[PDB]
Design an enzyme around this catalytic site. Structure first.
Site, PDB file in Angstrom:
ATOM      1  N   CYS A   1      74.613  89.206  69.231  1.00 57.19           N
ATOM      2  CA  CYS A   1      75.220  88.234  68.395  1.00 57.19           C
ATOM      3  C   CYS A   1      74.511  88.280  67.173  1.00 57.19           C
ATOM      4  O   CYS A   1      73.477  88.806  66.685  1.00 57.19           O
ATOM      5  CB  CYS A   1      75.022  86.882  69.064  1.00 57.19           C
ATOM      6  SG  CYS A   1      73.151  86.174  68.987  1.00 57.19           S
TER       7      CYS A   1
ATOM      8  N   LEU B   1      68.937  80.693  68.324  1.00 54.92           N
ATOM      9  CA  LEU B   1      69.551  80.128  66.902  1.00 54.92           C
ATOM     10  C   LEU B   1      70.896  79.453  67.113  1.00 54.92           C
ATOM     11  O   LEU B   1      71.838  79.876  67.192  1.00 54.92           O
ATOM     12  CB  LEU B   1      69.367  80.891  66.099  1.00 54.92           C
ATOM     13  CG  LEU B   1      68.375  80.884  64.766  1.00 54.92           C
ATOM     14  CD1 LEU B   1      67.046  81.167  65.423  1.00 54.92           C
ATOM     15  CD2 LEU B   1      68.872  81.948  63.648  1.00 54.92           C
TER      16      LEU B   1
ATOM     17  N   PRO C   1      44.956  36.726  28.977  1.00 49.27           N
ATOM     18  CA  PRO C   1      44.431  38.100  28.192  1.00 49.27           C
ATOM     19  C   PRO C   1      43.315  38.791  29.139  1.00 49.27           C
ATOM     20  O   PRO C   1      43.137  39.903  28.889  1.00 49.27           O
ATOM     21  CB  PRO C   1      43.521  37.475  26.966  1.00 49.27           C
ATOM     22  CG  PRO C   1      43.922  36.003  26.792  1.00 49.27           C
ATOM     23  CD  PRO C   1      44.482  35.474  28.156  1.00 49.27           C
TER      24      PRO C   1
ATOM     25  N   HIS D   1      50.639  26.455  44.692  1.00 53.45           N
ATOM     26  CA  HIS D   1      50.392  27.631  43.442  1.00 53.45           C
ATOM     27  C   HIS D   1      51.666  28.433  43.211  1.00 53.45           C
ATOM     28  O   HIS D   1      51.535  29.372  42.808  1.00 53.45           O
ATOM     29  CB  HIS D   1      49.245  28.422  43.584  1.00 53.45           C
ATOM     30  CG  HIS D   1      48.356  28.597  42.420  1.00 53.45           C
ATOM     31  ND1 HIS D   1      47.419  27.768  42.137  1.00 53.45           N
ATOM     32  CD2 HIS D   1      48.267  29.516  41.629  1.00 53.45           C
ATOM     33  CE1 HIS D   1      46.864  27.900  40.865  1.00 53.45           C
ATOM     34  NE2 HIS D   1      47.343  29.046  40.543  1.00 53.45           N
TER      35      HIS D   1
ATOM     36  N   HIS E   1      50.378  26.073  32.734  1.00 54.76           N
ATOM     37  CA  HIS E   1      49.849  26.278  34.284  1.00 54.76           C
ATOM     38  C   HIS E   1      48.451  25.152  34.298  1.00 54.76           C
ATOM     39  O   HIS E   1      47.603  25.284  33.545  1.00 54.76           O
ATOM     40  CB  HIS E   1      49.484  27.356  34.669  1.00 54.76           C
ATOM     41  CG  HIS E   1      48.932  27.866  36.063  1.00 54.76           C
ATOM     42  ND1 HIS E   1      47.939  28.626  36.183  1.00 54.76           N
ATOM     43  CD2 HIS E   1      49.069  27.114  36.962  1.00 54.76           C
ATOM     44  CE1 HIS E   1      47.679  28.645  37.529  1.00 54.76           C
ATOM     45  NE2 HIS E   1      48.333  27.510  38.131  1.00 54.76           N
TER      46      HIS E   1
END
Lengths: 442, 716, 149
Positions: free
Chosen positions: B97, B267, B396, B571, B585
């Protein structure tokens, strides 16, 4: 432009073909960039889409779909982030090159159960493997799936992707979807949902895989925790009204602790029923020959009004007491509703036997949970895993997920198979079933 | 099969392990495929039964064979490639094959290989006998079984034209490639098909149709010079769709050929449709793997900066240590308001005296927008600092952590960190290691925010306005300075603004579901002293220095606990209110803390398997506060015990100078009812709801925001 | 990694060594000796007898009872010293008579030994732990008795 019938589908598919042909030449460098932008827009668009995923669907609640959309959008960009799916994969000196290639246009069916959670999962692995999808949602939840697909599309458009890479149908129909499956230009089908259309997907003459859901049984014996297993199952079944696939569908308990559960369930969140209304509940989920679409995802109390008997608002789920396990009794099939089946076991040994028939009834073995003491009885857990045929074995663990549970577990979906029954075990679908690798030899 | 069976029988195997059929028939084999006790089919051969094997309702794979094309161009070795194909087709009469079935050659060399074939082993045919062999192979629309595996010469006797015995294979010359031409199908006989190509480019195109005609792509081989033409082989692999791409190599095997190649069989594929690539069948397609999962108990942690320094005037002494250690380059991240004051020379001057390169970064405003952090990283990698010193409280100091990551990992995009690290509860993904070329020093300027000790960073995108929280225990600074000499002149309207933020910072980490025995003592110590002289720090400010110092060290104590146990839902609407009403806040969580406590002590839809049996409760944890802080009668009930705690919280505001309800806090009724719905279901998804044992609902997260608007007290 | 419930030697930078030829102690103390990761596990203390749980626990009680009153106590450690005493007054008696039959109490006692370790890593021990440090070295009595009487 909108598509009405097959005449415009037979032109929509050509645009996707042409986009796929050009997209297949992209390399790994800018394929991951498109992967990044698509995953972000899926996660950043979780709440808005979930609010409008229930306005027209009429089933489920918005609260639990936020986590489901969020978890599914970030898990894909969590393990498939960096793996070679383009260009050269490996190299064996032996000169052996193992480049890989995509498959092509992919069909995909999105159920009304999860119109958007699975729509963004499928859309996010195809553009990772350089192939395209066409989505065919249910008419009940068409607008939610299309928006979810379009969000990922527009996210990928402004990242280097071709224009018409993802498509969908508007006002779809059964005859229109049939023409999409028999189209000779589509070479993969990803089917999800109940055994209503996945059966037709297999009998289509094309390669197809199905993310199905079998009725997963939970086994509780006398040695297990009785005040803890009652609640882990209870919260995992009320998650999104029990529509999450591969959720609990039946519980099997030994005779020692049967009555020890019966009053507990009615105490916390259950409402047992044994009269003629049990027959009504059996008949209320069968409109003809199968499961109806009028009780899927609905809360427990309203379906009781349709069934006839009044049930208080606070009640969470309703549970029947049935001993026979066959087709005539409909309480063993998958229900996708906040209902549970309670079974009689004379001992632990018959409990596993009574669970084999339940798994085999679902066709595909997906998950199966057992609740037992895992520290002073280690032989029972070892025995439990070698008797069932399911892809996941969980002990003292809820089926789907919580609301500090385990985090590194794949979702309930993304787990497909390639056959209906005959002792088939599901597997996790990922960016390897959509890729073909070729080998060159020098 | 029986030989293998008997070999296995005398090795420990059961007796009837392998079976076979005798005198089989088509009707008998059909009953075997439809048997419900068989769950796999391995089909091999031509498209006679493998097509029916797929349409059987069972999982099946087929080891098929497609007509493999051979492409020989002008640059190939003609004298060598003529014989490699010649010997590979005569192997077992060309029945193995996936053997050669067609040869495609260009016109520049077509004539060269014609007489070579007839010279070595071929016999070409072009007359009336040409349309004799083609009619032999196909007789009924399918390949006949009378010429499979037979030598070339005898089949010529069937057509009636004599062919000499020595001849090996017979080859026709056909240009049209279709179904009516039978010379393109698989023949399994020592015959070959020769095709006309005008150039190399059409040769590959003429090979695409050949592979597609076989249905399943198995192998492809083309002969070319692989040393001076490396682009052609690369182009050849991206156009053919087969499992194997061979060059200068016979298809099947030799009779010093390559040894580590799988056989032509073994295969298989799983579809008869077009564009299907075969794969090697092995002991993985016949096996199913199951996974078990064990409920593993979760472990907690207690992660803090290496050093924390605190006392009245502790900045210069702590800064000195850094000078003694090797540290030449450092940059300072700061806000705007404090630089115009004398709040920047107290750190730079002590640095210049020792001598180090320090630069000014004065552009960070109240909320980082991913645009100034990017330019900060651009200044960072343009300076190559060794120590990053943060300044300011909140904005910051949160942005300095992101600058540190982007400076230490320039290649990693920010949007990659937006989906991996956003909550500190998972431990399966690790941050790239940090501190290699820098380290973070954190200094605070306001009393009541412990952001210098927690691994939290929130980044806003100025494009759309969406927040991208980041959280992992690698952004924690390596050192935290808690000095109080820089808070002696803060306005009395703001000293308590953050002061009440720490109250909710500590009160919320105590009732969290992640609260452990390590973070319970510190969460309680912060609350104990905040009813002692925190109001004194309000009314005096500078008349009582020591109280302000004592309160300032408590903000870190509140923060040292919630860095290990995440905050609750209070929160979260605090985050949401402070970003759309532009209220600061500290206020937001101040006027709804007196309303979210009552929504945590009742019968109440609760998350189960946690905070219901593993943790005791939340209503009695608040009861401990009333007795730990000493505001409870010797004999009283828990229900009334919380009442006096809430009463203390209310009557502290009588001198704390904070508004009674949100509407009086500077917001208008008109811009609430149209925005409350938009405002509700986003606080549900800001990485809160991990804590606050009660599982919240949108339907119950609006009545809180509507009840606080009119000042009305919640009751059911 | 700690295998005893009551000594906080995994988080504190203290180490004492003795000379070979002679016997005077060589104490060392530098914040730099603290391990950069400490593992506190409870399954490693499950079967040690009711003669080591009673002396380690008292050692932990002593480790925190004076760190609260030490002159080096700051507002950062009295929150942790005051918790170990609260934790050990309700779990040490339950971890002695019943032993491993009550596994929750053993875990609480073992975890609260490191909390006192945190408390006395920053504040330093009083005279109670110095005379007990020598009286337990000349008479060869174990550490935990000496600070108990």
């Amino acid at each position: 432009m909108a598509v009405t019938n097959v005449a415009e589908l037979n032109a929509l598919v050509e645009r996707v073909k042409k986009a796929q042909r050009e997209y297949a030449s992209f390399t790994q460098e800018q394929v991951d960039k498109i992967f990044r932008a698509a995953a972000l827009a899926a996660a950043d668009a979780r709440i808005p889409l979930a609010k409008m995923a229930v306005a027209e669907s009429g089933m489920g609640i918005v609260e639990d779909k936020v986590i489901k959309n969020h978890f599914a959008s970030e898990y894909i960009y969590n393990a498939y982030k960096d793996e070679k799916t383009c260009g050269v994969l490996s190299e064996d000196d032996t000169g052996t090159i193992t480049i890989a290639e995509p498959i092509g246009i992919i069909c995909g069916i999105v159920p009304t159960t999860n119109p958007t959670s699975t729509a963004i999962f499928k859309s996010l692995i195809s553009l990772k493997t350089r192939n395209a999808i066409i989505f065919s949602p249910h008419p009940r939840a068409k607008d939610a799936t299309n928006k979810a697909a379009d969000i990922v599309l527009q996210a990928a458009i402004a990242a280097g992707a071709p224009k018409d890479l993802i498509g969908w149908i508007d006002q779809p129909s059964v005859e229109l979807s049939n023409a999409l499956m028999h189209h000779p230009d589509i070479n993969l089908i990803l089917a999800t949902g109940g055994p209503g259309m996945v059966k037709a997907a297999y009998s289509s003459g094309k390669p197809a895989i199905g993310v199905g859901a079998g009725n997963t049984p939970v086994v509780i014996d006398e040695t297990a925790d009785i005040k803890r297993a009652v609640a882990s199952v209870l919260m995992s079944k009320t998650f999104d009204n029990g529509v999450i696939c591969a959720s609990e569908q039946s519980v099997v308990v030994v005779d020692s602790v049967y009555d020890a559960v019966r009053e507990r369930f009615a105490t916390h969140g259950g409402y047992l029923l044994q009269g003629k209304e049990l027959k009504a509940v059996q008949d209320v989920i069968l409109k003809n020959g199968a499961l109806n679409a009028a009780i899927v995802g609905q809360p427990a109390y309203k379906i009781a009004e349709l069934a006839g008997f009044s049930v208080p608002e606070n009640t969470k789920i309703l549970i029947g007491e049935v001993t026979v396990v066959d087709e005539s009794e409909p309480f063993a099939h998958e229900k996708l509703s906040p209902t549970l089946a309670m079974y009689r076991a004379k001992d632990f040994e018959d409990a596993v036997e009574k669970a084999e028939k339940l798994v085999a009834m679902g066709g595909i073995g997906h998950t199966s949970c057992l609740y037992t003491d895992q520290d002073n009885q280690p032989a029972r857990v070892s025995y439990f895993g070698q008797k069932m045929k399911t892809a996941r074995i969980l002990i003292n663990t809820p089926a789907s997920q919580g609301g500090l549970y385990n985090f590194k577990l794949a979702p309930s979906l993304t787990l497909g198979c390639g056959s209906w029954g005959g002792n088939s075990i599901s597997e996790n679908v990922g960016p390897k079933h959509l890729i073909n690798k070729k080998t060159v030899a020098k | 099969a029986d030989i293998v069976l008997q070999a296995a029988i005398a090795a420990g195997a059961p007796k009837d392990l392998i079976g076979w059929i005798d005198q089989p028939s088509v009707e008998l084999s059909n009953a075997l495929m439809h048997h419900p006790d068989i769950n796999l089919i391995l089909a091999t051969g031509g498209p006679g039964m493998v097509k029916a094997a797929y349409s059987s309702g069972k999982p099946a794979i087929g080891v098929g064979a497609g007509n493999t094309p051979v492409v020989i161009d002008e640059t190939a070795d003609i004298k060598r490639a003529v014989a490699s194909v010649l010997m590979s087709k005569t192997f077992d009469n060309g029945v193995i094959c996936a053997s050669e079935q067609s040869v495609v050659v260009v016109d520049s060399v077509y004539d060269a290989v014609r007489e070579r074939f007839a010279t070595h082993g071929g016999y070409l045919l072009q007359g009336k006998e040409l349309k004799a062999v083609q009619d032999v192979i196909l007789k009924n629309g399918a390949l006949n079984a009378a010429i499979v595996g037979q030598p070339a010469y005898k089949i010529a006797e069937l057509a009636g034209f004599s062919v000499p015995e020595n001849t090996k294979i017979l080859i026709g010359e056909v240009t049209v490639v279709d179904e009516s031409e039978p010379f393109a199908h698989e023949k399994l006989s020592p015959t070959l098909a020769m095709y006309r190509a005008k150039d190399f480019e059409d040769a590959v195109e003429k090979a695409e149709k050949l592979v597609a005609m076989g249905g399943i792509g198995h192998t492809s081989c083309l002969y070319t010079d692989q040393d001076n033409q490396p682009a052609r082989v690369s182009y050849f692999g991206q156009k053919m769709k087969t499992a194997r791409i061979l060059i200068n190599t016979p298809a099947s095997q030799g009779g010093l050929y390559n040894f580590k190649l799988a056989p032509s069989l073994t295969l298989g594929c799983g579809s008869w449709g077009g564009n299907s690539i075969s794969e090697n069948v092995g002991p993985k397609h016949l096996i199913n793997k199951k996974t078990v999962a064990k409920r593993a108990e979760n472990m907690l942690w207690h992660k803090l900066p290496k050093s924390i320094y605190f006392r009245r005037g502790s900045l210069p002494i702590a800064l000195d240590e850094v000078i003694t250690d090797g540290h030449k380059r450092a940059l300072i991240v700061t806000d705007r308001f404090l630089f115009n004051n004398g709040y920047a020379d107290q750190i730079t001057s002590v640095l210049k005296a020792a001598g180090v390169e320090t630069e000014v970064f004065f552009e960070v405003e109240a909320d980082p927008t991913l645009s100034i952090v990017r330019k900060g990283a651009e200044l960072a990698n343009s300076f190559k600092p060794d120590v990053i010193i943060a300044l300011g409280g909140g904005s910051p100091m949160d942005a300095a952590k992101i600058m540190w990551v982007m400076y230490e990992h320039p290649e990693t995009h920010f949007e990659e960190l937006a989906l991996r690290f956003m909550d500190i509860r998972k431990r399966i993904y690790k941050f790239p290691k940090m501190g290699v070329k820098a380290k973070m020093i954190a200094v605070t300027t306001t009393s009541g925010t412990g952001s210098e000790v927690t691994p939290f960073a929130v980044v806003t995108d100025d494009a759309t306005g969406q927040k991208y929280p980041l959280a992992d225990y690698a952004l924690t600074p390596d050192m935290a300075i808690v000095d109080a000499n820089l808070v002696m002149d803060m306005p009395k309207s703001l000293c308590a603004f953050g002061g009440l933020d720490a109250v909710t910072h500590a009160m919320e980490a105590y009732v969290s579901v992640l609260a452990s025995e390590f973070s319970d003592g510190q969460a309680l110590q912060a609350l104990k002293l905040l009813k002692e002289y925190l109001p004194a720090s309000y009314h005096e400010g500078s008349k009582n220095p020591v109280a302000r110092e004592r309160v300032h060290s408590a903000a870190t104590i509140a923060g040292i606990a919630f860095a290990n146990a995440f905050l609750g839902v209070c929160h979260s609407m605090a985050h949401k209110l402070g970003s759309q009403f532009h209220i600061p806040h500290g206020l937001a969580n101040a006027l709804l803390i007196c309303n979210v406590i009552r929504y945590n002590a009742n019968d109440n839809t609760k998350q189960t398997a946690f905070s219901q049996y593993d943790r005791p409760q939340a209503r009695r944890r608040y009861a401990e506060i009333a007795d730990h802080l000493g505001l409870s009668a010797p004999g009283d009930r828990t229900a009334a015990k919380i009442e006096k705690l809430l009463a203390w919280l209310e009557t502290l505001k009588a001198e704390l100078g904070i508004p009674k309800s949100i509407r009086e806090a500077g917001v208008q009724e008109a811009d609430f009812l149209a925005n409350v719905d938009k405002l509700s279901e986003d606080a549900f998804d800001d990485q809160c709801t991990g804590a606050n044992p009660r599982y919240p609902l949108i339907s119950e997260l609006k009545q809180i925001l509507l009840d606080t608007y009119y000042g009305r007290d919640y009751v059911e």
